Amino acid sequence: SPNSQYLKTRILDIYTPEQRAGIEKSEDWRQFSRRMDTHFPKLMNELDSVYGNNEALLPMLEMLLAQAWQSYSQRNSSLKDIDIARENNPDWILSNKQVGGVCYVDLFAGDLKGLKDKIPYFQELGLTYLHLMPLFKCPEGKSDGGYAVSSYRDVNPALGTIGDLREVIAALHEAGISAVVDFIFNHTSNEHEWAQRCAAGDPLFDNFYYIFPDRRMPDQYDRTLREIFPDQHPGGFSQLEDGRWVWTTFNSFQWDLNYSNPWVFRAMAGEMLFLANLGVDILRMDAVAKIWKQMGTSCENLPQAHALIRAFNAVMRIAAPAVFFKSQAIVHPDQVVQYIGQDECQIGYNPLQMALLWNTLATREVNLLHQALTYRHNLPEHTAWVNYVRSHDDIGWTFADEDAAYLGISGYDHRQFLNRFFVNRFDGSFARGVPFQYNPSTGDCRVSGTAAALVGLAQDDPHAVDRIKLLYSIALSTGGLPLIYLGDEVGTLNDDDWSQDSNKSDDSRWAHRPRYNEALYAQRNDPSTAAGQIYQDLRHMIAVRQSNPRFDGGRLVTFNTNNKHIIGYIRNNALLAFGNFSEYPQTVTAHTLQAMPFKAHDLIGGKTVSLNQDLTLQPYQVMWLEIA
Numbered sequence: 001s002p003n004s005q006y007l008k009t010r011i012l013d014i015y016t017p018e019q020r021a022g023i024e025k026s027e028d029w030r031q032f033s034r035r036m037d038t039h040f041p042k043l044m045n046e047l048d049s050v051y052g053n054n055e056a057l058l059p060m061l062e063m064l065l066a067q068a069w070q071s072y073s074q075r076n077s078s079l080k081d082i083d084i085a086r087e088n089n090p091d092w093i094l095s096n097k098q099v100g101g102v103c104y105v106d107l108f109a110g111d112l113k114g115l116k117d118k119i120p121y122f123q124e125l126g127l128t129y130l131h132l133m134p135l136f137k138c139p140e141g142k143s144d145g146g147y148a149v150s151s152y153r154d155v156n157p158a159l160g161t162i163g164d165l166r167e168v169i170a171a172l173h174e175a176g177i178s179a180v181v182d183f184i185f186n187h188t189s190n191e192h193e194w195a196q197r198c199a200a201g202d203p204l205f206d207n208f209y210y211i212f213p214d215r216r217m218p219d220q221y222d223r224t225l226r227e228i229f230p231d232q233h234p235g236g237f238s239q240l241e242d243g244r245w246v247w248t249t250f251n252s253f254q255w256d257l258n259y260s261n262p263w264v265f266r267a268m269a270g271e272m273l274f275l276a277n278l279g280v281d282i283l284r285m286d287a288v289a290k291i292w293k294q295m296g297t298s299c300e301n302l303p304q305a306h307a308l309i310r311a312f313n314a315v316m317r318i319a320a321p322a323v324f325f326k327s328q329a330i331v332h333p334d335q336v337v338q339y340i341g342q343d344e345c346q347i348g349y350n351p352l353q354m355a356l357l358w359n360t361l362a363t364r365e366v367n368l369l370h371q372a373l374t375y376r377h378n379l380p381e382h383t384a385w386v387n388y389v390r391s392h393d394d395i396g397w398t399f400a401d402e403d404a405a406y407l408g409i410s411g412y413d414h415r416q417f418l419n420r421f422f423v424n425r426f427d428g429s430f431a432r433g434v435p436f437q438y439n440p441s442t443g444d445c446r447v448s449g450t451a452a453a454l455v456g457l458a459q460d461d462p463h464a465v466d467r468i469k470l471l472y473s474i475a476l477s478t479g480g481l482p483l484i485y486l487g488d489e490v491g492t493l494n495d496d497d498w499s500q501d502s503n504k505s506d507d508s509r510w511a512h513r514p515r516y517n518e519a520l521y522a523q524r525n526d527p528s529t530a531a532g533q534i535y536q537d538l539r540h541m542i543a544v545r546q547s548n549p550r551f552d553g554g555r556l557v558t559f560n561t562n563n564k565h566i567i568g569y570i571r572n573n574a575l576l577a578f579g580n581f582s583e584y585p586q587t588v589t590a591h592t593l594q595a596m597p598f599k600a601h602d603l604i605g606g607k608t609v610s611l612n613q614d615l616t617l618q619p620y621q622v623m624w625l626e627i628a
């Protein structure tokens with residue numbers, strides 16, 4: 001039954017009495033020792049519930065915490081300053097000053113050096129937070145856009161070196177920007193040293209993955225598994241050349257790590273420590289839902305999965321307190337929120353709000369959006385949503401069917417409409433998206449396409465610009481950390497030649513992953529062009545959000561607009577937000593506006609607005625009203 005003091009002397013064992021004296025009197029040790037006393041009990045409790053009486057548990061922990069000391073000992077002192085800051089301010093994530101951006105290093109800026117050169121622009125745009133897409137060594141050719149990781153410790157050589165990454169992170173900190181990076185902890189590539197060695201039968205790598213002699217067990221699992229990339233293969237398994245089968249939730253070249261082995265936790269915790277010491281502020285925990293497998297279940301959102309993530313959290317509290325987790329879970333809304341906790345992932349993607357933003361543009365009806373913002377927005381203390389419009393991924397229509405039923409909506413019919421609308425198979429749709437993973441056996445389908453393509457900008461729809469403005473306004477103002485897909489701010493369209501690369505032709509997500517459009521960025525300071533209007537709008541909303549404390553925190557209360565086309569919510573009893581999702585003008589009545597002040601300044605238009613009479617919003621207009 002190992003404890004804090006026990007492991008601390010196991011750690012201090014390697015030192016001679018001469019250095020032990022200097023170590024024990026040092027601040028580094030004093031801090032580590034305090035943090036062990038505070039957080040180790042949590043680590044022990046979480047791992048005990050997963051690994052029980054496992055023989056490997058004790059020695060795994062002796063090794064892991066020695067590594068943790070050695071990692072913290074080596075940790076840059078600038079980062080140790082950030083550790084203390086974030087320990088003492090858990091709510092930094094909840095500040096209205098936080099605005100995020102995300103890009104592919106190669107597609108946006110060429111390489112890590114070019115990314116560093118682009119930092120003055122992130123400053124111009126107002127970012128405090130930057131997510132760099134998977135930047136690690138991966139298979140040449142097909143790699144799932146870097147999501148098949150061949151090494152967590154090596155940069156993708158097209159991008160530069162680990163030293164460049166260190167340099168870039170340092171420059172981002174100097175510029176007041178947090179560095180955000182993926183921790184792809186559910187699976188590695190099949191080319192990872194661990195995968196190669198486990199498959200070869202190296203006993204040190206026994207049970208690093210899920211490997212089977214035939215179809216017997218994969219057949220048992222497949223009957224309860226959801227299909228993630230049905231285009232690629234059925235179920236959750238792929239066959240090796242020697243005849244065996246390996247768990248592959250995603251592509252065949254992505255092998256699911258086996259977390260029922262305590263050594264796998266150890267291995268991945270060591271890689272996590274390495275990334276922490278790069279100065280990474282937030283790790284996007286990729287596919288959090290899948291890290292525990294259980295026969296007879298969906299192998300999604302299992303209690304042990306939560307417990308393991310909570311264990312990973314404890315390790316950071318002990319050895320790099322500055323590092324927070326970002327949950328990536330595209331599941332039922334009831335399951336999305338369960339990853340979000342101070343002792344789990346402090347922030348999480350908000351795919352419900354995102355999906356419903358696009359839903360509401362299509363139907364023009366705020367019913368589902370209003371419902372979601374009313375019952376599913378508010379979070380526990382010291383946690384926040386990451387609010388977004390578009391990402392590197394396809395759009396899944398992951399609203400709750402039970403929730404929809406109350407508004408007289410049937411799941412499939414609605415999703416079929418949504419899928420047809422956004423892929424331009426519907427009468428007069430403005431959207432120019434392409435299908436992704438149409439599953440003929442179930443009817444499920446997702447949508448690829450850039451924000452600009454989905455709103456009608458490719459064919460110069462006169463409402464397109466306002467649509468982008470409107471969607472982003474909600475992400476920026478509901479409460480939580482808003483994330484811009486970089487390129488959106490100048491209206492970057494689809495790369496229509498995406499499938500000409502034979503390594504990209506089987507994954508339509510590439511359509512919404514275009515290179516930096518030089519011409520559009522050159523027009524960002526010219527308000528005449530679409531790029532300039534979008535840039536001016538988004539830049540204006542960012543500036544308002546970051547300097548106005550009415551936007552602070554993550555809580556909201558919805559406001560009943562009594563118009564099916566207009567969304568209403570209130571921030572801090574002081575900011576009233578109206579968003580019209582109709583291409584026609586829409587009215588909030590005097591009667592409905594009774595409780596409000598007679599006049600209010602609109603932060604979007606810059607006008608004073610009257611609320612003692614009918615308020616009429618132009619097509620797609622957003623108002624940000626100071627009511628207190």
Ligand SMILES: OC[C@H]1O[C@@](CO)(O[C@H]2O[C@H](CO)[C@@H](O)[C@H](O)[C@H]2O)[C@@H](O)[C@@H]1O
Nearest residue numbers: 144147228250286287328329330393394
């Ligand atoms: O359509 C992608 C599919 O995978 C998810 C799992 O959370 O997305 C993440 O995981 C994949 C494997 O690493 C990546 O391909 C993807 O880029 C990543 O965001 C879900 O978004 C979705 O169900």
Ligand SMILES: OC[C@H]1O[C@@](CO)(O[C@H]2O[C@H](CO)[C@@H](O)[C@H](O)[C@H]2O)[C@@H](O)[C@@H]1O
Nearest residue numbers: 231434435436437438439505506507508
């Ligand atoms: O559709 C063009 C292009 O997209 C891909 C890659 O994702 O397949 C998508 O579209 C197909 C039909 O439009 C669907 O059957 C499939 O499920 C979806 O992924 C390519 O295969 C296709 O060439």
Ligand SMILES: [Cl-]
Nearest residue numbers: 289329330331
């Ligand atoms: Cl997911």
